[PDB]
């Protein structure tokens, strides 16, 4: 149902970044194609971090993979094999609620 | 300074057009269902009815409390009853005292 | 390398009006050892403030930090933020790669 909120514990968002839009578009499509994510979002960002001792500001693409706990490990292993960085950003968030309809769509897609 | 929070919520959803996001944002805040809404364009790749679609969408992030969340979620779905929108709720673990207070006072 | 449950990593979220303000804050936070990484995303924001509903363009900021630096980043940010009442919302990731968790902790 489209209007009922439910508590959820098995949904996961995995956030990473890559340098170019072509890379991100390729990773997103390949993850959905492989059944490792139901949906992947990309948005351009600026990132500031220290590298080789100096502050760097770089344009990057922030990716959000929407997946379940059951595919999370396989997604992270797969990304490490395909990610262009030696040491990719990798943070996982847990949604605590969703709609029944969206949770069902997500699980069905995986 | 920081305080641990259990009752604040961020509702994340997507809509197809910028005009819809702007209208929803305004009306949700006007109604006291959210205190603040942010909108960010994104490109999304997803599985829909077997196939892979790539679309530009507006990511919306609504700042609310657990008390208004069910109401906000239902209201949003009433505005695009044809769609099956992204609905993901996050819970912040902390906030400032002042921000938490402003947010709560903004809801109706 | 593999995923590991995390309890000590934090994402502090805030907004500022302009890209220049965002860049300056980000750089200073990193330089001061209060955050490991800062991301900046252009957004539109709708909120209730000063008795009205405004829509403005803003920069969304996400500070990557640990719990050990969080109080100090928050205190510092309060003194340096251009806004009267800064957005202050903290998220906790539930996992990360071993390498990235180690990078983040090590960078601070």
PDB file of C-alpha atoms in Angstrom, chain B residues 2 8 92 94-96 99-100, chain C residues 12-15 74 85-90:
ATOM      1  CA  UNK B   2      24.717  18.803  20.649  1.00  0.00           C
ATOM      2  CA  UNK B   8      13.469  13.874  14.509  1.00  0.00           C
ATOM      3  CA  UNK B  92      19.347  11.626  13.008  1.00  0.00           C
ATOM      4  CA  UNK B  94      21.886  14.169  17.278  1.00  0.00           C
ATOM      5  CA  UNK B  95      21.157  17.842  16.608  1.00  0.00           C
ATOM      6  CA  UNK B  96      21.694  21.120  18.353  1.00  0.00           C
ATOM      7  CA  UNK B  99      17.696  23.455  15.740  1.00  0.00           C
ATOM      8  CA  UNK B 100      15.587  20.725  17.366  1.00  0.00           C
TER       9      UNK B 100
ATOM     10  CA  UNK C  12      27.187  16.345  10.261  1.00  0.00           C
ATOM     11  CA  UNK C  13      24.740  18.050   7.885  1.00  0.00           C
ATOM     12  CA  UNK C  14      24.301  21.819   7.546  1.00  0.00           C
ATOM     13  CA  UNK C  15      23.562  24.437   4.881  1.00  0.00           C
ATOM     14  CA  UNK C  74      29.907  21.552  16.266  1.00  0.00           C
ATOM     15  CA  UNK C  85      20.401  29.273  13.488  1.00  0.00           C
ATOM     16  CA  UNK C  86      22.478  26.784  11.508  1.00  0.00           C
ATOM     17  CA  UNK C  87      21.053  23.489  10.393  1.00  0.00           C
ATOM     18  CA  UNK C  88      22.621  20.864  12.607  1.00  0.00           C
ATOM     19  CA  UNK C  89      21.664  17.283  11.954  1.00  0.00           C
ATOM     20  CA  UNK C  90      23.908  14.322  12.617  1.00  0.00           C
TER      21      UNK C  90
END
